[PDB]
Design a protein around this ligand. Structure first.
Ligand SMILES: CCCCCC(=O)OC[C@H](COP(=O)(O)OCC[N+](C)(C)C)OC(=O)CCCCC
Ligand SMILES: CCCCCC(=O)OC[C@H](COP(=O)(O)OCC[N+](C)(C)C)OC(=O)CCCCC
Ligand SMILES: [Ca+2]
Ligand SMILES: [Ca+2]
Ligand SMILES: [Ca+2]
Ligand SMILES: [Ca+2]
Ligand SMILES: [Ca+2]
Ligand SMILES: [Ca+2]
Ligand SMILES: [Mg+2]
Lengths: 126, 126
């Protein structure tokens, strides 16, 4: 049964970059995408901001999790385009590291120089 | 005598622009400069953020004011460069519109499309 509520708040990122050459062509237009393969709603995403290497989203998402399935959070940092969007990086979070009732601020890192702040919590359905 | 403490918190700006052509050449690298000609320290400024059209500064400044002088706040939105920095816009605030003990959130506008959030307060010296 799916009985665990996994809340993810994507707060902000700092120094988003496509690389030296990539940034010269196009200032990153970042959004974040959240993916849990084991969850019933697999994929979610934040809005994008144009031309902002330190975007602030403060968007909150809720997943419904099965405690008996392997649940892993995939966080993808994206650059929006008119053409096809570009994947800048990906970081994973083992949700099995959290414990019920726990709320935690997690900082992820992309391409060594980019950081992202998340706030993760886990509760029962009620 | 200088006996009024005028506190200014520059919080953030949204959609900073140098214009259509200017933005294509250079994504704004914004900072804010504060100027009160009648104050003993005339000029102050925030740090800049590279390539960020929605910068967040949250920097607090303190001016000392003479209640018998005309005190007007000049807010200049700047773009940082290696060369000479460029002036994007200027907005004024009559400090004689504030009351002692009053604390107020003010939103300024530059070039019709750029907004800036300030937090202004006025107290007497302790
Ligand atoms: C290199 C010289 C300028 C190229 C450039 O980045 O500006 C053009 C514009 C800039 O695109 P951008 O400012 O990044 O804004 C669009 C962002 N999206 C696609 C997410 C709405 O995109 C196109 O029109 C092509
Ligand atoms: C198309 C035109 C490309 C200009 C450009 O933005 O890329 C070059 C980069 C632009 O510098 P930028 O990323 O805006 O930031 C330099 C750091 N500041 C803004 C403090 C001078 O370095 C320059 O010397 C100009
Ligand atoms: Ca651009
Ligand atoms: Ca861009
Ligand atoms: Ca883009
Ligand atoms: Ca640039
Ligand atoms: Ca720039
Ligand atoms: Ca600049
Ligand atoms: Mg920003």
């Amino acid at each position: 049964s799916y009985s665990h509520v996994f809340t993810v708040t994507v707060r902000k990122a700092t120094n988003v970059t496509k690389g030296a050459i990539g940034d010269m062509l196009d200032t990153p237009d970042p959004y974040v995408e959240l993916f849990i393969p084991s969850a019933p709603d697999c994929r979610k995403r934040t809005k994008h901001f144009n031309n902002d290497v330190n975007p602030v989203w403060n968007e909150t998402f809720e997943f419904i999790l099965d405690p008996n399935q392997d649940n892993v959070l995939e966080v993808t940092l994206m650059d929006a385009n008119y053409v096809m969007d570009e994947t800048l990086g990906m970081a994973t979070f083992p949700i099995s590291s959290l414990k019920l009732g726990e709320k935690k601020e997690v900082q992820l890192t992309f391409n060594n120089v980019t950081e992202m702040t998340l706030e993760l919590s886990l509760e029962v359905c009620s």
